[PDB]
Write a protein that binds this ligand. Sequence first.
Ligand SMILES: OC[C@H]1O[C@H](O[C@H]2O[C@H](CO)[C@@H](O)[C@H](O)[C@H]2O)[C@H](O)[C@@H](O)[C@@H]1O
Ligand SMILES: OC[C@H]1O[C@H](O[C@H]2O[C@H](CO)[C@@H](O)[C@H](O)[C@H]2O)[C@H](O)[C@@H](O)[C@@H]1O
Ligand SMILES: OC[C@H]1O[C@@H](O)[C@H](O)[C@@H](O)[C@@H]1O
Ligand SMILES: [Mg+2]
Length: 580
Amino acid sequence: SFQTQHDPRTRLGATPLPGGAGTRFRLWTSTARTVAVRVNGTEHVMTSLGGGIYELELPVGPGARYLFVLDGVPTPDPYARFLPDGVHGEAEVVDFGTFDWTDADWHGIKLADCVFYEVHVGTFTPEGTYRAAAEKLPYLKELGVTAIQVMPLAAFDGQRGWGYDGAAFYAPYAPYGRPEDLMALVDAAHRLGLGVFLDVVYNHFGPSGNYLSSYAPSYFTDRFSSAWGMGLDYAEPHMRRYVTGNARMWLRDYHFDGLRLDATPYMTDDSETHILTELAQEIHELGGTHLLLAEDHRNLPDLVTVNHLDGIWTDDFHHETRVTLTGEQEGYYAGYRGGAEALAYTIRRGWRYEGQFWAVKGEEHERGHPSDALEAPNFVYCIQNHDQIGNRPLGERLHQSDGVTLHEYRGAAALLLTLPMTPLLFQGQEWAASTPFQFFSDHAGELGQAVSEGRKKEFDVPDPQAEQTFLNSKLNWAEREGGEHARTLRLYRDLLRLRREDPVLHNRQRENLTTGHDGDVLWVRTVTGAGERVLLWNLGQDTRAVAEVKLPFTVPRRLLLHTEGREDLTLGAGEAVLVG
Ligand SMILES: OC[C@H]1O[C@H](O[C@H]2O[C@H](CO)[C@@H](O)[C@H](O)[C@H]2O)[C@H](O)[C@@H](O)[C@@H]1O
Ligand SMILES: OC[C@H]1O[C@H](O[C@H]2O[C@H](CO)[C@@H](O)[C@H](O)[C@H]2O)[C@H](O)[C@@H](O)[C@@H]1O
Ligand SMILES: OC[C@H]1O[C@@H](O)[C@H](O)[C@@H](O)[C@@H]1O
Ligand SMILES: [Mg+2]
């Protein structure tokens, strides 16, 4: 008996009418005295309905260009479905009923079956478009990933960016392609049996192109701020519906299988029903199998058990792994010792911090909560993602950091891809890509100069505003064909096949997973009715024979996969083996 707050009849923005009657334009404003829509260059006064709601129906169709005129000021539509001239331009009327979907036999994907592959549309291919990305779908299918995780697509200012400066949340970023190009990508993925997930940013709007305050200051509050402006006021129902209507668009109209909510700790809301719970309600009302994941650092199980999200990106595993391999201690890395015994504990507990003091300078508090309620798929683990590469001064990848060998990098992949937690890979990880993933942007005027200045001060650091920084982050596909890149890719293919085929690795219960260590050797054991597997990873500097590892059980005898393809059960420095 939850009832959606959304009715297509009353949808804000421009919505095609039935019977070829045209388009219904609607907006909410708390402050404008005169309100008009300017369609294909001609102004038309809109009808006041009360409650600050204004509406007009005209016989224009999909493809018509428009914006709203508030007290005589031409203002983009925050509910724009497409912005062909960018975030300060006219919107285009879009009809979601015109695309010929062929994915009727696709029925979504369960979290326990996801292996995510994080794509940044702009850098994933030379062209940096959806159409070019769709051409790599057969590669990803054969690689053995099962869900693409796309970085944010909401329109932002400039000709490249990561996506976190999105300002028009309903409008896919025009340089990547038109709406039907996005639909084509999703339909192609579904035809190959791949899920597609979208990163969405409901904690802030970017600095350029967010016109919501021009309509009603009360979308936002001064009670708290975001990175870019005033905080999003989730006590205001129109603000709540801006983001729940957006989530429903992506899932229903673009056929995404799920959403990754950026920075959920910063979605502040003191309402009786928290906005995260209402999002889950609103997406579930669609009657599909869509998932919601939270990017959340609080180690808070209530995201799943109270807000009814499906899982959480949980960085403790990533951080413990990077410190193990590099020894680094700057910033939040100071929260971790690293090492076999540390990694065994973090895996056992799902996350490390369950209420203990977080001693990181400038951040000290009792961090986290007991993870007992969560099951293995609820934790999303990685050793690389956009932030854990791009937030480094030079954007270098894990195998490119000082002191990391390709053998250790290959071992880390084995640990990630045999655990029952839900893994995520970053584009190009699988072939130990040679290119960095740096922070790049393309803001105009003084804002652009401020970004460049802010990056320099925070940490030669590549200028985010420079074209070269974007281009240096482009994937080089040809390199995967040779050398150590090809060797790494063969290993990733082998690991993903094992994950898919091995009956014991199908385990998704923490009850069946144990971990421990002997010196610098980590072991992870899975036991189910199908048998036993043990992953051993030598995190030492020396060679270790499997026979000589002290274990509280009898080690399995059969060598299933060795990360350096050795015939004997011996581990060189940084190497791993799976036995059964
Ligand atoms: O303050 C947030 C919540 O804290 C508790 O819930 C966490 O800790 C419990 C045991 O301390 C776990 O059982 C639970 O799964 C965790 O989310 C508290 O029990 C909740 O009511 C609070 O909302
Ligand atoms: O060598 C001095 C450091 O020794 C320890 O750090 C090493 O050993 C950890 C496992 O105990 C690894 O995770 C880490 O990468 C190594 O650098 C110690 O923890 C450090 O505080 C010392 O500076
Ligand atoms: O991963 C733990 C870290 O999460 C970050 O994204 C938080 O902003 C930071 O303050 C914390 O140290
Ligand atoms: Mg020992």
